[PDB]
Design a protein around this ligand. Sequence first.
Ligand SMILES: *C/C=C(\C)c1ccc(-c2ccc(N(C)C)cc2)cc1
Length: 133
Amino acid sequence: TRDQNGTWEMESNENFEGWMKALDIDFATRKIAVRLTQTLVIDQDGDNFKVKSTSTFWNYDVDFTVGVEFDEYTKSLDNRHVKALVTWEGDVLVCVQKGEKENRGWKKWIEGDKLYEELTCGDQVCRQVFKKK
Ligand SMILES: *C/C=C(\C)c1ccc(-c2ccc(N(C)C)cc2)cc1
């Protein structure tokens, strides 16, 4: 299923700090952020997505249309400019962010009643699982 609509509450988080390090997030921010439970809110209508990543420490929103390249500033994450593109590979939603960092992007897919997410940058992969609330 390609339907990722919903409010998703984090169940597990692996190597989040490795991913943040590959983005050069500073020590203070990483040490706090790695402790925290996350929420993902996804509003999906056809190709149009609105995605929100939230915790008690950050609130990060992005809107995109599947298949349409967009220039993006990554704002409070790491303050960089990328060219971003989100597409479908089967039922895996795949984002590639072209720029300074290699292998930068994410993937999301549904496995049952849960949302699986990969965050990638450099040689680091962070793996997360969310439950539908
Ligand atoms: C599908 C997942 C997306 C678009 C996403 C974007 C950004 C983040 C994110 C933002 C900010 C931070 N900080 C400040 C540590 C971490 C991760 C997560 C997911």
